[PDB]
Design a protein around this ligand. Structure first.
Ligand code: B12
Length: 228
């Protein structure tokens, strides 16, 4: 009750710091329902889902990582935060209206060795809201699996989230065949994630667009893939 009044005060004030703190606590405790309810309440106060993703979920998860690294959190608490985040976004995603099917398919995944996939999930939701069909190969996906999927389904778009790249040599070797396949089937490549801050990683992953976040990604989709 006292916590509710504080939370509504924060929602009326659009106080992102307060909202992040409340969400952080629910996430690291693994309290899915508190996370679900908080995110829905925040949405119904007039905050779009993308804004919640960019200015609540992302900052919180970044901070969690920093605290884990210093040993203030254990690794499983990051996992808890992931579960709560997945649950909270899915809840909202299942209940909110989507643009009608636009006749397009997006192939999504993360590279081999990377198990980070929340960003990918956020992106895939955004695509579906925009009317895309999405096929996820999930995290830790070899480029030949991407290539197979392209050969079978001929997607218009390939999205890659990369947080860590463990094997620079392997990806350097594999990328040629993958890229040639993409181009043969007329797909575009969009990349995003922390790993692409490394100039060498970015150079390997030949792309049509590199996204900073969901907002500019959406701007790309709207320019390059107009709504029918
Ligand atoms: C949660 C977490 C985990 C979870 C992942 C669970 C899951 N996803 O199912 C678990 C516990 C498995 C994990 C494991 C590990 N992780 Co970890 N993890 C994190 C954390 C907190 C991720 C938070 C997150 O998902 N943020 C949400 C997203 C949305 O933010 P984002 O990535 O910035 O994405 C935004 C943009 O980049 C963009 N974007 C991103 N991708 C894409 C793609 C497209 C197509 C588009 C358009 C846009 C886009 O849009 C997003 C929204 O704005 C980070 C901390 C961090 N991020 O700084 C550490 C972090 C990534 N992990 C780290 C490490 C070290 C590990 C481990 C090695 C730890 C260990 N010893 O066990 C392992 C390695 C696992 C592996 N093989 O990859 C380090 C990486 C350091 C480095 N640079 O090399 C980090 C940075 C923590 C730290 N501060 O040290 N991790």
């Amino acid at each position: 009750a006292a916590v509710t009044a504080s939370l509504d005060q924060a929602l009326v004030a659009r106080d992102w710091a307060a909202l992040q703190a409340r969400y952080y606590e629910a996430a690291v405790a693994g309290d899915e329902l508190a996370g679900v309810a908080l995110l829905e309440r925040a949405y119904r106060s007039g905050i779009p889902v993308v804004a919640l993703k960019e200015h609540v979920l992302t900052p919180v998860l970044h901070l969690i990582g920093e605290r884990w690294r210093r040993g203030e959190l254990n690794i499983w608490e990051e996992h808890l935060a992931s579960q709560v985040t997945l649950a909270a976004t899915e809840h909202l995603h299942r209940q909110l209206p989507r643009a009608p099917f636009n006749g397009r398919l997006a192939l999504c995944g993360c590279p081999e060795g990377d198990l980070h996939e929340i960003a990918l999930h956020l992106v895939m939701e955004v695509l579906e809201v925009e009317g895309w069909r999405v096929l996820s190969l999930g995290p830790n996906t070899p480029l030949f699996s991407f290539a197979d999927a392209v050969r079978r389904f001929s997607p218009q778009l390939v999205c890659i989230s990369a947080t860590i790249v463990h094997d620079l040599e392997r990806l350097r070797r594999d990328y040629g065949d993958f890229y040639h396949t993409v181009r043969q089937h007329g797909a575009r490549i969009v990349i995003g994630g922390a790993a692409f801050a490394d100039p060498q990683v970015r150079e390997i992953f030949i792309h049509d667009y590199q996204a900073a976040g969901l907002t500019d990604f959406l701007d790309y989709l709207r320019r390059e893939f107009p709504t029918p």
